[PDB]
Design a protein around this ligand. Structure first.
Ligand SMILES: Nc1ncnc2c1ncn2[C@@H]1O[C@H](CSCC[C@H](N)C(=O)O)[C@@H](O)[C@H]1O
Ligand SMILES: Nc1ncnc2c1ncn2[C@@H]1O[C@H](CSCC[C@H](N)C(=O)O)[C@@H](O)[C@H]1O
Ligand SMILES: N[C@@H](Cc1ccc(O)cc1)C(=O)O
Ligand SMILES: N[C@@H](Cc1ccc(O)cc1)C(=O)O
Lengths: 216, 216
């Protein structure tokens, strides 16, 4: 039932209710020509409005998952599914054949449309859609590999054997929520080295190892 | 004298003179709060003004080199220099230690500042600067490896031996200008496979092979 890549705690959400009246948000609403509740949170635009938010260090960074998805979906290997788990626990499925906008502003608009319409389609074919399941459900039947600095050292030919779920954080700061780790069930923690790497770099390195083994 | 990565024909330029009076450009100038001549060409904003441009299929795509630079500079391996050759033949040197903005709009602003001021600095240290040389000069003393689909099949341990210049196009469509190829001098053409891949994917794959050999 195949492998999957799952981006965890992706920094992807609409502007939270309680900051929608802030001047920085109202100003962006005017510039964008739509209501605050429809706009994706982006700390390059909304920073001054975000002071009161919980876990703020994780929030307002849709650029991270944008770039990771672009690279991953550019792979010529088509034997995996792609999911995005958001900071708020929502599950988005991305059809392996989806061509995402390469321009960040166009990506943001597409994500806004996704949050509004709940699915993006090519006629009868679904390209991107929220699923009414949790993180625990998309890792069913797959060996979960959680990439974290504190993890262990393993041979990739062994790691990327059968059906795997490659799980990489897509947020800029902090550690995984305890809830996220509980949802993963059984998992193996895998480290690439003694330093904190970016989501994009980890995606790149893991994709390369994955293709080495599996394309093969 | 070390290896280098060179992004070729990067789609990075200010709005050309002859389209500065177009309504789409004047509208963006108002939104940005500065003169057309200072604004980076971006076909997600300026498409309708670009109809009369030569080699238009290559132009207005700074997102491509943005993402490739982010990934490359995220590498933990510090034994290489980084250059960007633009569509107009300009040479930009990027200090290996530079942290580029991850947000595309902030990157665009930094590139606009670079074109205006000609250098970006951390006090006395240069982070990014135009160099008064040509493409032929930055590949002096290095084995040029030009990544193209029509190239040959080689072992990477042999390819990435001594001082190399890894050259990857950073434009969306078309083929290299003949002038660009002439500037490279002696070079080996290297193919990754029988398909056209994105700049980001090629950067990722080559970086991974480079690190395998050299980090080692
Ligand atoms: N050394 C490493 N080995 C394996 N994965 C790593 C890694 N460094 C970062 N990652 C992965 O890259 C993601 C983005 S970094 C997220 C913030 C980070 N926890 C600090 O502190 C992480 O969530 C993790 O999935
Ligand atoms: N199969 C392949 N093998 C090696 N490099 C490739 C490749 N496919 C694309 N590239 C590299 O990726 C860059 C971006 S693609 C640029 C447009 C492309 N010439 C079409 O047609 C190219 O300029 C080249 O440097
Ligand atoms: N690439 C590292 C692997 C590693 C991973 C985590 C560590 O804590 C240490 C080492 C090496 O070969 O050394
Ligand atoms: N990765 C390819 C290499 C290749 C490159 C260019 C080609 O035209 C063909 C094959 C392989 O192992 O088959």
């Amino acid at each position: 039932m195949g492998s999957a890549f799952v981006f965890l705690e992706a920094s992807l959400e609409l502007i939270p209710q309680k900051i929608r009246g802030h001047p920085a948000v109202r100003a962006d609403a005017i510039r964008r020509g739509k209501r605050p509740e429809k706009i994706l949170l982006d700390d390059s635009k909304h920073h001054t409005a975000m002071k009161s938010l919980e876990f703020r260090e994780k929030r307002g960074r849709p650029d991270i998952v944008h770039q990771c998805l672009l690279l991953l979906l550019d792979s010529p290997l088509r034997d995996f599914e792609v999911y995005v788990h958001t900071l708020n626990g929502e599950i988005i499925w991305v059809n392996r054949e989806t061509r995402l906008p390469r321009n960040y502003n166009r990506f943001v608009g597409l994500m806004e449309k996704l949050f509004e319409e709940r699915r993006i389609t090519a006629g009868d074919t679904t390209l991107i859609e929220f699923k009414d399941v949790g993180l625990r459900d998309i890792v069913r039947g797959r060996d979960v590999l959680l990439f974290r600095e504190k993890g262990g050292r393993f041979e990739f030919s062994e790691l990327l054997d059968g059906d795997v779920a490659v799980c990489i954080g897509a947020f800029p700061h902090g550690d995984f929520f305890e809830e996220t780790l509980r949802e993963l069930g059984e998992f193996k923690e895998v480290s690439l080295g003694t330093e904190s790497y970016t989501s994009l770099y980890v995606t790149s390195r893991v994709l390369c190892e994955y293709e080495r083994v599996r394309a093969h």
